[PDB]
Design a protein around this ligand. Sequence first.
Ligand SMILES: Cc1cc2nc3c(=O)[nH]c(=O)nc-3n(C[C@H](O)[C@H](O)[C@H](O)COP(=O)(O)OP(=O)(O)OC[C@H]3O[C@@H](n4cnc5c(N)ncnc54)[C@H](O)[C@@H]3O)c2cc1C
Ligand SMILES: Cc1cc2nc3c(=O)[nH]c(=O)nc-3n(C[C@H](O)[C@H](O)[C@H](O)COP(=O)(O)OP(=O)(O)OC[C@H]3O[C@@H](n4cnc5c(N)ncnc54)[C@H](O)[C@@H]3O)c2cc1C
Lengths: 394, 394
Amino acid sequence: MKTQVAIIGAGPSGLLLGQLLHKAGIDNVILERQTPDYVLGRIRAGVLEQGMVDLLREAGVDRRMARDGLVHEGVEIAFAGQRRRIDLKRLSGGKTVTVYGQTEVTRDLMEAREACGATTVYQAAEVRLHDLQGERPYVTFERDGERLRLDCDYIAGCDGFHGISRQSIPAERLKVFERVYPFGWLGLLADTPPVSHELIYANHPRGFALCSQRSATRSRYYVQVPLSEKVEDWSDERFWTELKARLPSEVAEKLVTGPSLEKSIAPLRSFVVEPMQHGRLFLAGDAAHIVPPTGAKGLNLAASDVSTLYRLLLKAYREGRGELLERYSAICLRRIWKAERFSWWMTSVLHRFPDTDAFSQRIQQTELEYYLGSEAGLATIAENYVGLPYEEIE
Amino acid sequence: MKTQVAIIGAGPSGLLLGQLLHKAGIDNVILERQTPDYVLGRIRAGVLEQGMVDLLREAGVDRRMARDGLVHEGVEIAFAGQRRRIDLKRLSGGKTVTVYGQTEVTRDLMEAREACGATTVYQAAEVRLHDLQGERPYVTFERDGERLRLDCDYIAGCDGFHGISRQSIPAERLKVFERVYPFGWLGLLADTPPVSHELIYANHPRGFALCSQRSATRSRYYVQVPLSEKVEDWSDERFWTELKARLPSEVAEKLVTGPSLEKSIAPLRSFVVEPMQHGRLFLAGDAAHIVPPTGAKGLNLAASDVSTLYRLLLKAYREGRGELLERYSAICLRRIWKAERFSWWMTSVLHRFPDTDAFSQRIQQTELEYYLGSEAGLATIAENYVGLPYEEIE
Ligand SMILES: Cc1cc2nc3c(=O)[nH]c(=O)nc-3n(C[C@H](O)[C@H](O)[C@H](O)COP(=O)(O)OP(=O)(O)OC[C@H]3O[C@@H](n4cnc5c(N)ncnc54)[C@H](O)[C@@H]3O)c2cc1C
Ligand SMILES: Cc1cc2nc3c(=O)[nH]c(=O)nc-3n(C[C@H](O)[C@H](O)[C@H](O)COP(=O)(O)OP(=O)(O)OC[C@H]3O[C@@H](n4cnc5c(N)ncnc54)[C@H](O)[C@@H]3O)c2cc1C
């Protein structure tokens, strides 16, 4: 069994890369440990950058998104009982973000891939990567019993934080950078209408809160919770009481509560591995890095990783330019570190940290007051939020 | 012995306030523990904001400064071997900073005060403040032996961090905010020409370094040093070797070294007391707050404190509006906290901290890369550096 690009993981990353590759005639096979159904169960991302929206268009998978997506020209930040709006469009010079659930994005790429008839092996057990530094690497796996082999020229590891590809690069060749936050996010998806037509990030003495959405009849809310919490400890009622308690009154007031469709706890982390490739293995998305959700950069970085990998696989294949692939890591990390720094900054100014002395508290509040009151401060938030520009390559 | 405004401390603060008050006909007496000569021995500040320069003009003490001062339209930041210039003038929309030693400023106010013949008691021992909450407070002190009393209506505590005025407000009525940095600044004043016509702030793996100046034939350099160091452990030669080692080669190369005129170690601290007044006592400058030198805000905040106190003492005296003085603290802290936050940010991105993990290191470098590469990032540095605008009052 042979292919040109073996792809580990059928998440937004592998699917998006697989799709882009297919359009250029570069054969690829995707391997997924789970079922189409499990992958679709993950809620995750709601905010998409401009570059991601255009990338979705280039892969010809933007019909439903252009229809149901919601373009947002601003986002709000509330602290000390005062909402301050950031005009993304104005401040970024025309860019905006699009709210469209990751579940939907994944669902659209899954359909586009099935129609075009490209290979996709779900429930691919025991995926193992071999001969990474050879001229001819290969992947082995077990499809419901029998051990199958798949030869390829390149492997794109799009298997996420707990994937096998990063584990396959010799530990000694990687440099890991990581920060674990002492809190997590308790998320609740409801079939009620959102409290505001725009996202509201909230810094409150009780902890962080975020009012987001998926459509006009579906909401996604988040509250900061310590690591000790177990989701089973939060009835819907406790969550609503808590959310209402962290929001500005004129907001808590019009909030339409209702039963939860999903509730999960996501702990915050920052992680970067350098480099992002080894021999004929290239890491992408969550396989290579993790950003805390505060900045909404995760899925968005995956897109630029993929966008970069695709453009280089083209040069290498179509133009017979295989030496250019040695640049992937260099090119990606620049955007990764800026995105990481932004995500880190958002998290530090919006959440409540445990052993915080009076001076730090005061500094946190002044950071908000400053960046939120200055035209230059607002612009740094905005350009980073809409997402910094992708790099050209070469 | 009576006066209208008793002033504790003949530093830039008390002298500047005393001068401004005198021009409006508001009598004041200044009390200084030291000799005119000791006060003149302190080197300290070299950078002045726009607002301070104009305030010096309003007090009619800007002749020598307009002559010898140096207006700087930019400052530089070097890191990872690359100088990046910040166009203060361009980015701030016309503002600049003026390099003029604090020794000179203090010397000019001392002369202006002696000519006009206003009272000034040097070597005022045992200054003690009484009846702070009464309608008629008073100061006691010992002039070379005899205990003298001085009645006044108001007391402006301009005695610095180790002054007596802040110690005189009941500890229970104050809220202190403080951060002590695990490093200090080793400064060296030389009668050699500066290495660059503009200040060069330097982040280097060995530690922070700063190339500043006082005139065209006098330089002031600083290097970061841990708290364990004793100044007697740094020969001039060691300092030059060290400075050269932390700078970019094309800079270390043209550096003209020479014998030190002064060498001192200044530890970094951040301190704010809230409120800044008690009864008929008003704190100003270093008596009320301390900022690490990184941002060059210290002397500059003193000026706005004084500028605010003066304008309110006028309303109260000339316009018989004494209830307005209850606003002093409110008005001052806003500017103090923004200035503190800026100073804190500068310090954190330019110095090397001890127990720093790989992720923080990387974040520090990306902060520089980002703010220094973005037009909006550069603007946040610039507007804060030239100094945020003073508030109107009322
Ligand atoms: C609360 C939350 C909110 C977020 N909000 C945002 C936001 O609004 N905007 C934003 O940009 N980002 C946000 N994200 C991040 C975003 O969801 C992720 O970065 C994104 O899901 C990563 O895409 P991925 O394809 O790289 O990996 P994944 O989504 O994890 O998918 C990887 C796939 O590979 C599969 N796989 C794993 N191991 C193997 C194996 N060993 N063999 C074969 N297959 C394997 C997995 O089953 C999975 O299907 C958020 C994340 C969370 C949790
Ligand atoms: C290395 C260094 C660099 C700096 N660089 C800058 C820079 O470029 N820009 C900037 O804006 N700031 C900078 N500063 C800060 C600036 O020097 C101070 O903020 C400023 O000196 C404070 O003015 P002040 O009058 O409030 O107090 P001080 O300068 O301390 O003077 C207070 C006076 O009151 C007197 N006094 C004290 N106790 C008593 C008493 N109990 N009775 C009577 N009199 C008393 C003292 O003797 C002293 O004369 C720097 C400081 C340092 C150390």
